[PDB]
C-alpha cells in the first residue's frame, strides 16, 4: 500500500519524564530492605543502577574508581590517546586486588625512580624485587616506608635494599591475608610458588577498601569494574584490542545515530573477534533499531536521542524521541531477547531515574548530574560541562549517589518493589497535564 507512510506521519505520540507519575501500589517492602542491584550480563553486575557517561567532563580513572566503589560503573571517555585510555583502564583495574595475580616487579639494578613511578601510577605503595626477569625469583621489596629515608632516587635498589620476609602461597585470599598481615604486623604480603618465584602481591589497602566500600562492583578476581567508549572509525579495532589487553569489563560503542549501517557492521565485527566481550551499543530510540543492534551482537543497548541536557539535536536537526517512550519502546523489544537497556540522558532528578527504570531500563546513565562532582576530570567553586556549559561544584560523588539511591528506594517502596525486575515489570504510570506537573514541584 503506497500511501501508508504518508498517512501515518503524525500518528505516533510520546512521553517524557514530566508527563507522568508512578502510581502507588500494595507494598510489603520497606525502602531500606529493597535490592537496587542489576545484572547487565554475568560478567557485568552492578550493585546500583548507575553509570557515569563517557564524556571528557565526566569520566576518567578517578571517576570510574569512585563509581565502581559505589556499586555503579564508569565509562572512560574516548577523547584521549588510545595508549592513554588503556592506561586509564589499567589504573581502574589495578586500584585494588590488581597485582594479586599479575604483579609488577623490579630488579636490584633498577633505580628508585622506577619504584616511585609504579607506586605513583597505581597508588599501590610497595614494589616486589626479583633477582632477574627470566628467573622471577623475588629477593627484596621496596615500599613507601623505605622511600622516606631515601633522598636521591637515582640510586639503585641494591643500595637502599635484606632479612627473611613473610610470604604466602598463591591463591591466598583476602580474609586469609587479613589475619597474616594482622598476626605479623605487615602491610605487604608477597605471594610465591614453592620455588619462591613471585606470583602475586597483597596489601592492606586491598583489605581495607573492601571494608570501606562494601557495595563495590567488581569482577570475579575482585577488581573494580570499568567500561570504555569507542567510536565507529577506522581506529575502532586497534583501540578495542588495547582495552581488552587492559582487561576493561565493557566497551561502549558510542555514536550519534546507532541505527546507521556502519554501526551495525562494526558490532558484528567486534562480536566476531571477541565472543565473550561486553558490548554496549547505542544510541537508539526505536524498537527496530534496538532489534538490529541485538542481532548484530550487542549484549546491552543504550537509549535516547535528543534527551541530553546539553544536546542540541532536537533544535538543530529537528530529531528525537521523548525519553520515556524511547526507553519503553526499546525495552519492549529488548525484553524479548533477555537484553538490558541503558537510559541515557534527560535525567534531572532522582524521580526521573526511578521513572526511567520503571519504563523498562535496567540502568541509567548520567552526564550532567556528575559533572561538578569532585572526582570528575575538571578542576564559589566551579567546574565545566561540555558535549559548552556550567554546573555547581557538587562535592564527592558519594553524596550525589546516596540521594539518588535514596530516591530510588523510596520510589520502590511506594510501588511495592522488592527489586528492579519487579519494578520494570509491574510499575504503572499515570499521565498528567502541564498543570498536573506544576503541583508536583513545590
Amino acid at each position: 500500500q503506497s500511501n501508508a507512510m504518508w498517512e501515518s506521519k503524525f500518528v505516533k505520540e510520546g512521553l517524557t519524564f514530566d508527563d507522568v507519575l508512578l502510581v502507588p501500589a500494595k507494598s510489603d517492602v520497606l525502602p531500606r530492605e529493597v535490592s537496587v542491584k542489576t545484572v547487565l550480563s554475568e560478567s557485568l553486575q552492578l550493585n546500583i543502577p548507575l553509570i557515569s557517561a563517557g564524556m571528557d567532563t565526566v569520566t576518567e580513572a578517578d571517576m570510574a574508581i569512585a563509581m565502581a566503589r559505589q556499586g555503579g560503573l564508569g565509562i572512560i571517555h574516548k577523547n584521549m590517546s588510545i595508549e592513554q585510555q588503556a592506561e586509564q583502564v589499567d589504573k581502574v583495574k589495578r586500584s585494588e586486588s590488581g597485582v594479586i595475580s599479575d604483579p609488577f616487579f623490579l630488579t636490584p639494578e633498577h633505580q628508585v625512580y622506577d619504584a616511585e613511578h609504579l607506586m605513583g601510577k597505581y597508588r599501590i605503595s610497595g614494589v616486589p624485587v626479583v633477582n632477574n626477569l627470566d628467573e622471577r625469583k623475588l629477593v627484596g621489596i621496596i615500599t613507601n616506608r623505605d622511600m622516606r629515608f631515601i633522598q636521591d632516587y637515582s640510586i639503585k635498589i641494591s643500595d637502599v635494599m635484606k632479612e627473611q620476609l613473610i610470604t604466602a602461597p598463591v591463591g591466598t585470599t583476602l580474609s586469609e591475608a587479613e589475619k597474616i598481615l594482622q598476626k605479623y604486623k605487615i602491610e605487604k604480603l608477597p605471594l610465591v610458588d614453592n620455588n619462591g618465584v613471585l606470583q602475586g602481591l597483597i596489601t592492606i589497602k586491598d583489605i581495607e577498601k573492601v571494608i570501606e566500600f562494601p557495595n563495590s562492583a567488581k569482577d570475579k578476581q575482585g577488581r573494580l569494574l570499568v567500561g570504555a567508549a569507542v567510536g565507529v572509525t577506522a581506529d575502532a579495532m586497534t583501540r578495542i584490542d588495547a582495552l581488552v589487553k587492559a582487561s576493561v569489563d565493557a566497551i561502549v560503542l558510542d555514536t550519534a545515530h546507532g541505527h546507521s549501517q556502519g554501526v551495525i557492521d562494526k558490532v558484528k565485527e567486534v562480536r566476531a573477534k571477541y565472543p565473550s566481550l561486553n558490548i554496549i551499543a547505542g544510541n537508539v530510540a526505536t524498537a527496530e533499531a534496538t532489534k538490529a543492534l541485538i542481532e548484530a551482537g550487542a549484549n546491552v543497548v543504550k537509549v535516547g536521542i535528543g534527551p541530553g541536557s546539553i544536546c542540541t539535536t532536537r533544535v538543530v536537526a529537528g530529531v528525537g524521541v521523548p525519553q520515556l517512550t524511547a526507553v519503553y519502546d526499546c525495552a519492549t523489544e529488548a525484553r524479548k531477547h533477555g537484553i538490558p537497556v541503558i537510559a541515557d540522558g534527560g535525567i534531572k532528578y532522582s524521580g526521573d531515574m526511578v521513572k526511567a527504570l520503571a519504563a523498562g531500563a535496567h540502568v541509567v546513565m548520567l552526564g550532567s548530574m556528575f559533572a561538578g562532582v569532585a572526582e570528575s576530570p575538571g578542576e564559589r567553586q566551579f567546574k565545566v560541562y561540555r558535549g559548552e556549559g556550567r554546573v555547581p561544584y557538587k562535592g564527592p560523588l558519594a553524596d550525589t549517589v546516596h540521594q539518588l539511591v535514596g530516591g530510588l528506594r523510596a520510589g520502590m517502596g511506594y510501588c511495592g518493589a522488592q527489586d528492579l525486575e519487579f519494578l520494570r515489570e509491574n510499575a504503572q504510570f499515570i499521565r498528567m497535564s502541564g498543570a498536573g506537573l506544576l503541583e508536583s514541584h513545590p
Copy 2:
C-alpha cells in the same frame, strides 16, 4: 495473560485542580441558605468541611480549639511527647464544658500554686475545694477573683479560704445554669449530689462560648471535638491508649504509603481493641488501597500522595497521583462502603476546595493555608512552615475560614447544591487546557 501489566503501563490519565471547572447548574438555593455541615461518623460531626493538618507548624491545642469553634476539626500533631500530646488533647476537651461531668478539685491542704496550675492549664478560672479526696464533699471554691488579693501562692487553701454557696444538682444544663448564674449574679456554679458530694462544675465561660461560637463542632457532652495523629511504630498502641483516656474524638494513622502491609495490620489491630473509635487512615491514592483500609477497619480514609505544597515525593521518588483523580478514584470505592474520604494536600484557593468536595471528598485537610494563622504553633510579621519554608502571617484563623466557607457557598450556589451530599453526587466538571486556565485567573 502475562503481558497485560507491561502493555497498560502508560494507559492511565489523571487530573488536578487546574485542569477543571465546575459547571453551573439549575439552582433554587442561595449561598447563604446552603448547608456546609458534614458527618464523618455519628460521633464525628463537623459544621464545616475543614480539618487542620497534624503537623508541627500547623496544629496544637490553640489551633484545635480555634478549628472546632468554627465547626471544623484540629489534628494534634505527633511530633511531641506522648504525655505532651495527651495533655494537648485534654486541653481541647476541657476548653469548654469539660469539668461538668469530670471536675478537678483541691483540698484545704493544697497550696494556691495548685490552684494557679489548674486554672492556667485549662483556662477555667475557678476551682472546687472538697474536704478530702475519699469523701468528695465540697467545702469551698477558690477562683480568679480570689487570686487578685493573694500575694503569696505558697499559703494553703485554708488561709485564703466560708459562707453558704449556691450549688445545683447534677444534670443541670447550660440553659438552666444561664438563669441561675444570672438570677444570683455568680460566674461559678458547682454541681453536687443530694449528699453535697462534688459531681461537676459550670462556669459562665461554658455559657458565653456557646453564644460566641454557635457553629462549634462538639461531642454529645458538648465539648470541642479533637483529633490526634499517630504513626505506625512500636509506639503506636501506647500512644493511642493515652489519647483514648484523653477522650479525643479521632485518631489519624498518618503514614507516607498507606497501602503498605504494616499499616493495614495496625488498623486491624486498633479496630480490634477499640471497636467504637474513629480511625482516620491514610494516605492513599487508589481505589484498591482505599478498599484495603476500609476492610481493615478504617472508618475514614485520607487521600493524596504527592499533592502537598511542601511535598517533594513527586520530584524525589517520581511518585504520585493528580489530586482530583485521586479523590475521585478513592471516593468511587469508598462510596460503596458508605465511607467518607478526606482530601489532603494541594489546595491553594477556596475554589480548589470546592472542586475537591465535588470530586467526592467529604472534608478537606489544609496545612499551608493555616500555617501563618495566629493560632498555629510558631511565633513585617513572619511564621515558619515545614513537613522547610515560609508563608505570610494571616491573622486569626476565623478570617481564613470565612473566605473559605464563603467560596464554598458561592460554588454550591452555582451548582444548585443545598448540601454537600448533593454536591458530591451531582456536580459536573469541564476539563480545560493550560490556556483555558490562563483566563480563569485574572
Copy 3:
C-alpha cells in the same frame, strides 16, 4: 440509572479563545465590502456587533451615546439611583431627534435658570416658549445665542424675550428641515399644528450628527438606542417601570447565576407586564440554562460565567466554562429558537471577538477594553476598572472601535463571509496546543 451523574463527572471538555484559530476559506468578498450589522430584534438593530458593559467603570450616558453613534449599544449600569438611571437613559434618548415628537417648553413666567438647566441637561441649546401649559401655544424661543447677552439668569423669559418666527408642520423630516434651516439661515425649527400649538422642535444638531455619525444605531423615531441593567431584587419592577417611561430600548437582567430559579421567575414576570420589551437575560454557560431563559421570555441571552478579566469566580468558587465552548453550547440551543446570544467576557484582542462571533454569538460585550476610553465614567494619564484594577487611558471610544471592526472585517475576509450570519453558520476552527499559541503571537 443511578450511577450516570457520578460516572460522567469528568467527561465534558471545553475550549477558550487561545485554543483555536479560524480556518481560511474560499472568499469572494473583501473586508471593506462585508456587512458587520446585526439584528438582536426588530426593535434592536446594531450596525456593529458591540455592546459596552453595564458597569460603573464602563457605561453611563456619555458612553452609551458614543457607542450608539458607532453602531453599537451602551448599557447604563445599575449602580446608581433609579431616578438617576432613568435620567441617564433620557439623556441618551434625547441626544439627537429627542424633542421632535416630545418637546420641552417654558413659559414667559419661568426664569432663565430654567432655560439653562434644559439646554445643559440635554445638550440641545434652544428652548421653546408657550403662552401657558394648558394652551400649548408657542410664543417665543430662547436659545444659546440669546444667553450670551444675559448677565443675570434670575430674570424672567418675558424680559430677555418678539418677531414672527419660521415654523414648520408636524411630521416634517430631517432632510426637509435641512433645506428650510439652510434657505432661511436658522438653527432652530419649531413644529406646530394648524393652530400654532407646539408639537416638536428640530435643530441643526439633529441634522449634522446624522452626517457626522452615519453608522449610528437608532430607533424608528431616529433617536440613539440605549440599554439599562436591572438586578433581580424587590427593586426590579419599579426600576424597569421608570426606564420604560424613559423609552430605553432594552433592559439587561444581570445576575451572577442566570440559571437560578429567582431569575427565571423575574423574566416571566417582566415579559408578562411588557410583551414587546427587549429583555436581555444572563449570565449562562449551558444549553439547558439557555433554554430556560428563552422559555421564560428572554428575547436575548447573555453568555459566560468565569471568563471576565476581573472575574474571580473561577478561583474563589471553582466555577466556570471556557468561553468559546460556552458560546457554542448556548448558541447551539438558542439557534433552535431563532434567539441571539451575547458573548460576555474574556475578549482581549480583536481576534477573540471574531472567534466569539464565529462560535455563534450575535454580538460581544466588552468591559475592560472600554474602561480607559475617554467617554467612560472615570476621570501619564490613568483611569480605574472594577467589578479593583487599572488599564491605560485609551483616548476616544471611536479609535478602539475602528481597530475592532477592522479586525472583524479582515477575519470575515479570510473566512469568505459577506455577513455575520454566514460567519456564525459556516466558519470552522482548528484546535492548537499551547505551543501552537506561542507562534500565533509574535
Copy 4:
C-alpha cells in the same frame, strides 16, 4: 444535511513545529553524502531548499545574488517602482554570464560617463565599442584598467580609445574561454561573428565566480536564477510584462488570502499569457485552496497563513493554521498534481526547516532569519525588520546558510534520507507535550 457545518466547527486539529520531532530511522547515508537539491520545475532548480522572502527588509539585488550563489533563490520585493524592480532583476541576471549572448556596447561617440554607468550598474568592468548601432561592428573595448588613467569622464571614447584585439567565435564556452584568457593573459574576451560583428562578451569574473560558488543555482544559459513578487492589482500584468522582459525566472503572486477569487482569476490570466512562466502563488493553508491555485495554473504553491514571526493575523483577525498541519494538508493535495509547495513563515531554527521539509514542503521561505544578514537592504551593529522590529546583525548570508544546510544534512542522516524526496515521502514524526518540548531545548 443542514447541520454538518455547525457540528464540525471545533473538530479539526493542528500541529506546529514545537509539537513534534522527527523519528530516527535506519540510515546508510552520511550527512555529507546526502543531496539537498530540489526541483521546483524544469526551469527552476535549486541546489539548496531555501528562498529569501520578497520583503523590503529582506530581498533586493544583493540578496538575490547571494542566495542564488548558495544554490537558493531570492525574491525581489514589490515595494519599489516597476522600473526599479525590473532593474533589480536585470542586475541579478547579468551578475555573471549576462552579456555572453546579449551584450551592452558603446560607440566612439559616447562619453566615458556612459562606460562608468554600465560597469557600475552591472559590476562587469569592461565595455565593448562598436562603430555604430546599426552596424554592430566592434572597434574597441574600454575597461576598468583604462579608467584609472582617465581624469575627466566627459571626454569621448575616441580620445582615450587601437591595436588588434583577441576575440572568439560565438558559442565559445567558459571552459574554452578559461584557456584563452589564460594563454593570452586577457581578462576580457569579446565574441564576434565571421564578419566581426559583436555577439557577446566573456570576462574572467564569469569564470572565477563559477569556481568560487560551485553550488550556484542558474538557468540553462548559466545566469543566476531570480524571482520577483507581484501583487494582485490593476498593476499586475504591466509589472509582470516588464519582469519577463527582465528574464527573471519566477514571479510570486503574493497576497494575504490566496483562496480569494480575485487571486485565482489573476493566476488564470497570467498562465494564459505566459504558458511557460514559473508562477508561484500563495498564501494558502488548506488542501481546497491548494487545489484551486493549481487548477488556476500555479506551478508552485506557497503556504502558511498566520505563522510569520511578525505576523499579527492570528491576534488581530483570529485567523490561521498551525504551520506543519498547513504544510502537510497542502502537500497532501499538491502531491496528486506533481506540484511542489513552499513553506512560508514560522521557522526559528534549522530543526524547524527540517520538519517543514519532512511534512511535505519542497522548499522553505525565510524572512526573519535573513533580515540582519549583510546582503539585506537595510544598513553593536543593528538592522531593521518589518512586514516593525529588530534582529541582530548576522554577518554575510553564507554563514547562516551553512548552519541551516548543516542542520538539514544531520536531520537527513538521522532519518536515513539520501535526498529530499525520500524525506518528504518516508519521514515520520512523534508528537510531544509542552513538557516534551522543554527538554528538547537545553
